[PDB]
RNA sequence: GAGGAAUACCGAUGGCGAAGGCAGCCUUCUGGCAUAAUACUGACACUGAGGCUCGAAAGCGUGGGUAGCAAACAGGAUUAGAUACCCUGGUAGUCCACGCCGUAAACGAUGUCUACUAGUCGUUGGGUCCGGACUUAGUGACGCAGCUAACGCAAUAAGUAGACCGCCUGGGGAGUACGGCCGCAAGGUUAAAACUCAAAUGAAUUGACGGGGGCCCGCACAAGCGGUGGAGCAUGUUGUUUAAU
């Protein structure tokens, strides 16, 4: 997640592009998933519920 | 002394630390939200990060840095406000990078809080 | 209320200046529905300050002191998931005028001059330069708003 | 620089395995499965009491290791208390080797094997034809008939039948006692009785309630004005006192 700010462009637009790049790169999601350890049974439950929801919709 | 610099924006959920170093990695200045009068809930806000970045930038600007590239790390809220503070303080940003430590399924995390 | 925004009542202007601002301040000074007593209190205050300062038209002076007393940022309680945050927000102009008038009356109600009209005139004079309990209350409110200055929810 | 553990992304009602389980990458050793055709054996099959094997995690023994996490434990908070939840540390354990243990909501709460019984849409591994079509072995979502107390199941049956095995017979007492057997131990396994109660249960229904969700209203709150609670007095009540109050 690296954004090289070009000439004369505002830091606001530069940080908007950086936020977009960082959201694409999955940075905050990955740092969230390490916040607490999650038991394999709860991971499997969460994934199975996600698959059921994704298939229904 | 130094014209090119790096601004590290280490931002946690509780605090955000804004250090400014040279290209090599030797710290020139730093500021924290907890070292700017804000404590507790106020300290973990984007505004406290804004004032911390303002203080650190204005302290390191006397060194001679005008060109700077930022290194954001952590999930805290001030990770976006500190960069705006640096940009509005007159710093010429070089690049915005997000170098946050991401293990590849390494050390076991602390247990989930039952609140 | 809970559904609609009532149409505000019309306030007829004061008889001796023709200004709804002075009429509303007379209402704020009023008690027990005594328009005559409130009007003579306010008029005594106004003539006292006018004769002391040598000003022909004191409605402009009252506007000046009112805009000087009016705050701009007030602290409002907000709830976000069980946290009571004292978020500073703007003050809508009607509430601005109401707060200014209420603060002026309540500050003039606690002074040491002999008559209430003298008290009100002294308070108007003091807030004209920028002193008095109305000014202290405005400064306190601004102090709290700036003391938070950290919640822009 | 040292070290240990786990292998982000891929990643998927995806895959493999009898189940328990099994995720970086590479080599070595090795099991099963799927598939097309030909050839071969010629009922060699199914199930299976006792028995044997394997069997998560925790735990145990000996010897190593020890980064993170973390029972116990220590301190800090919270609280009426707080041997908790939250915080800061933290040891066994988690890791390895070789053995024990033999238990889990070890679950699909659904024994294994065989045949037959509308259909529709996914996905995995093959195969054959002309991007589709078909056919296979899995793996999912629906949905007839049928079944079911109902929920629901429905070619991966809880349907229609058959073979063999396991098990149940009110709730507690109790998976407890005693006796065997197994185990280093923790314990496991097999498994009663007295006594006690007229219930205990399943599914669904209508309400009510939730420190469940959504939407809405009322001086309910919020924004304000004026009070009550402090004084004296009026009045009512309690208590007390009285012959009665």
Cα(C139)–Cα(A39) distance, rounded to whole angstroms?
55
C88-93, long-range: CB < 8 A, 24+ apart: C88/C144, C88/C145, C88/C146, C88/C148, C88/C149, C88/C151
The per-residue DSSP string of C89-113 comes to EE--HHHHHHHHHHHHHHHHTT--S
φ/ψ (deg, to 5) at B67: -90, 125
Cα(C19)–Cα(C42) distance, rounded to whole angstroms?
13
Q: What is the resolution of this structure in A?
A: 2.6
The Cβ-side half-sphere exposure at A17, using a 13 Å CA radius, reads 14
Numbered residues of chain A with Cβ closer than 8 Å to any chain B Cβ: 1-5, 10-12, 14-15, 18-19, 21-22, 25, 27-28, 30-32, 34-38
Contacts of C77 (CB under 8 A, 6+ apart): C84, C85, C86, C87
Inter-residue contact B18 to B30 (CB < 8 Å): yes
Instruction: Assign 3-class secondary structure to B73-91.
Output: CCCCCHHHHHHHHHHHCCC
Inter-residue contact C117 to C45 (CB < 8 Å): yes
- How many residues are present in chain C? 153
Inter-residue contact B84 to A19 (CB < 8 Å): no
Indicate the angle between helix axes C116-129 and C133-148, nearest 10 degrees: 50
The per-residue DSSP string of B22-46 comes to ESSS-EEEEEEGGGTT--TTGGGSH
A36 interaction partners in chain B (CB closer than 8 Å): 109-113
Q: Which helix (H) or strand (E) holds A43?
A: helix A40-56
Taking the C-alpha atoms of C85, C88, C92 and C95 in order, what is their torsion angle to the nearest 10 degrees? 70
Inter-residue contact C117 to C124 (CB < 8 Å): no
Contacts of A4 (CB under 8 A, 6+ apart): B94, B95
Cα(B43)–Cα(C137) distance, rounded to whole angstroms?
27
Cα(A37)–Cα(A33) distance, rounded to whole angstroms?
8
Angle (nearest 5°) at CA A49 between A48 and A54: 100
Q: Hey, what are B18's tokens? A: 């804004």
Inter-residue contact A19 to B83 (CB < 8 Å): no
Residue recorded with tokens 């997640």:
A1
Tell if the CB–CB gap between C151 and B45 is shorter than 8 Å: yes
The dihedral built from the CA positions of residue C131, C137, C141 and C144, taken in this order, carries a sign that is positive
**Residue B38 burial class via C-beta count within 10 angstroms: exposed 0-12, middle 13-18, buried 19 and up:** buried
Of B57, B48, B37, nearest to B13 by C-alpha is: B48
Task: Please give, chain by chain, protein residues whose CB is below 7 Å from any atom of strand D.
Answer: A 30, 37, 47-48, 50-52, 55-56; B 102-111, 113-115; C 1-3, 31, 99, 102
φ/ψ (deg, to 5) at A3: -120, 120
Nearest CA in chain C to B44: C150
Give how far Cα B33 sits from Cα of B9, B30, B51, B60, C80, Å: 11, 11, 7, 17, 22
Q: Which helix (H) or strand (E) holds C141?
A: helix C133-148
Of C85, C71, C99, nearest to C149 by C-alpha is: C85
Asked if B38 has any chain C CB less than 8 Å from its own CB, the reply is yes
| β B67-72/B4-8 pair status | parallel
Inter-residue contact B55 to B36 (CB < 8 Å): yes
Q: Which helix (H) or strand (E) holds C29?
A: helix C20-29
């Amino acid at each position: 997640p690296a954004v090289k700010v070009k000439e004369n462009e505002p830091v606001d637009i530069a940080i908007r592009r950086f936020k977009r790049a960082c959201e694409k790169a999955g940075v905050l999601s990955d740092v969230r998933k390490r916040e607490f350890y999650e038991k394999p049974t709860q991971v499997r439950k969460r994934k199975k519920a996600a698959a059921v929801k994704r298939y229904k919709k | 002394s130094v014209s090119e610099g790096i601004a590290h924006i280490h931002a946690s959920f509780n605090n955000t630390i804004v250090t400014i170093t040279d290209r090599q990695g030797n710290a020139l200045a730093w500021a924290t939200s907890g070292g700017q009068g804000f404590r507790g809930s106020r300290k973990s806000t984007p505004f406290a990060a804004q004032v911390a970045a303002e203080v650190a930038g204005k302290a390191a600007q006397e060194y001679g840095v005008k060109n700077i590239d930022v290194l954001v790390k952590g999930p805290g809220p001030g990770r976006e406000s500190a960069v705006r503070a640096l940009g509005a303080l007159g710093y010429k940003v070089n690049s915005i990078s997000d170098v946050t430590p991401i293990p590849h399924n390494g050390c076991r995390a602390p247990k989930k809080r039952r609140v | 209320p809970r559904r609609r925004v009532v149409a505000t009542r019309e306030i007829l202007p004061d008889p001796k200046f023709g200004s709804q601002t002075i009429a509303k301040f007379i209402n704020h000074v009023m008690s027990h529905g005594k328009k005559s007593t409130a009007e003579r209190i306010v008029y005594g205050a106004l003539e006292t300050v006018a004769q002391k300062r040598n000003i022909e038209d004191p409605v402009a002076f009252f506007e000046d002191v009112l805009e000087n007393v009016r705050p701009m940022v007030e602290v409002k309680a907000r709830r976000v998931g069980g946290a009571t945050y004292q978020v500073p927000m703007e003050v809508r102009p009607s509430r601005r005028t109401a707060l200014a008038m209420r603060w002026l009356a309540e500050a003039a109600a606690k002074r040491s001059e002999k008559s209430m009209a003298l008290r009100l005139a002294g308070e108007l004079s003091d807030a004209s330069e920028g002193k008095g309990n109305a000014m202290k209350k405005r400064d306190e409110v601004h102090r709290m708003a700036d003391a938070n200055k950290a919640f822009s929810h």
